[PDB]
Design a protein around this ligand. Sequence first.
Ligand SMILES: [Cl-]
Ligand SMILES: [Cl-]
Ligand code: NA
Length: 129
Amino acid sequence: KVFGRCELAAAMKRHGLDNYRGYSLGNWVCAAKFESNFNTQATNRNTDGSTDYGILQINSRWWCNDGRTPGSRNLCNIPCSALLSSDITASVNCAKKIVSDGNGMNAWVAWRNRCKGTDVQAWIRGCRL
Ligand SMILES: [Cl-]
Ligand SMILES: [Cl-]
Ligand code: NA
């Protein structure tokens, strides 16, 4: 599923992401835009053989099991394919665990490079929340 911007903002808000660990809704929408272009089916292979999955590009080395990342952990206790669903529930619940692990949203390289320190409220502007 390819979300609209306001559609994703509303779905993330309903799943508890607005101000989660102090990160306003605009940060999460900005991250999803540059991680996946709002596409729940996005995958990308990394150099170490891990793969990033879904609308927030969650990495198989630490967070989900894809059966092909040897010596990886599965800290969200899900198959990585669950992160590709049109229902973002699994991605959001895993994201909540990642952002809580000490490094905040710096875990997402696109957020660090393209959202951090910008006017992220622009990403939810005009949406009916
Ligand atoms: Cl915001
Ligand atoms: Cl933080
Ligand atoms: Na894994």
